[PDB]
């Protein structure tokens, strides 16, 4: 119709997450969200 | 017997690091299909 366009992202870019004492703790992302129960996304270099 | 020298510099190079990759198994295989997934379900034996 115009000439706008779009871009296609996907839905789920998969996510990087660490263990420790057999427990889960931390955790490297792509979006500035807690999507855990974590209280805190310190934004970091190249990652939050 | 030798006598007063003279100076001279050479250049060497060595490969030191090589820069590391990691790979997704199911995101590389399915690509986000459930049922794809589902039918992988029984090979996380092989490709763990
Ligand atoms: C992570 O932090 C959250 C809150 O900051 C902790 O949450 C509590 O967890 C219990 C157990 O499920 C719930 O009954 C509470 O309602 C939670 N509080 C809130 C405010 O959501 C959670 O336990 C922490 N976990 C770790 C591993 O640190
Ligand atoms: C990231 O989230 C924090 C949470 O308060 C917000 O203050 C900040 O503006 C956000 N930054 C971006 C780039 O979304
Ligand atoms: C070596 O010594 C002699 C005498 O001191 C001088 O004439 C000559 O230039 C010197 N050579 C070098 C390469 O320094």
Avoid: H
């Amino acid at each position: 119709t115009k000439g706008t366009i779009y871009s296609i992202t996907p839905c789920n870019p998969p996510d990087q997450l660490v263990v420790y004492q057999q427990a889960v703790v931390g955790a490297m992302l792509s979006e500035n969200f807690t999507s855990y129960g974590f209280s805190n996304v310190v934004e970091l270099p190249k990652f939050f | 017997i030798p006598s007063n020298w003279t100076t001279s510099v050479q250049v060497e190079y060595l490969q030191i690091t090589s820069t590391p990759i990691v790979v997704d198994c199911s995101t590389y295989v399915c690509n986000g299909n459930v049922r794809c997934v589902e039918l992988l379900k029984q090979y996380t034996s092989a490709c763990k």
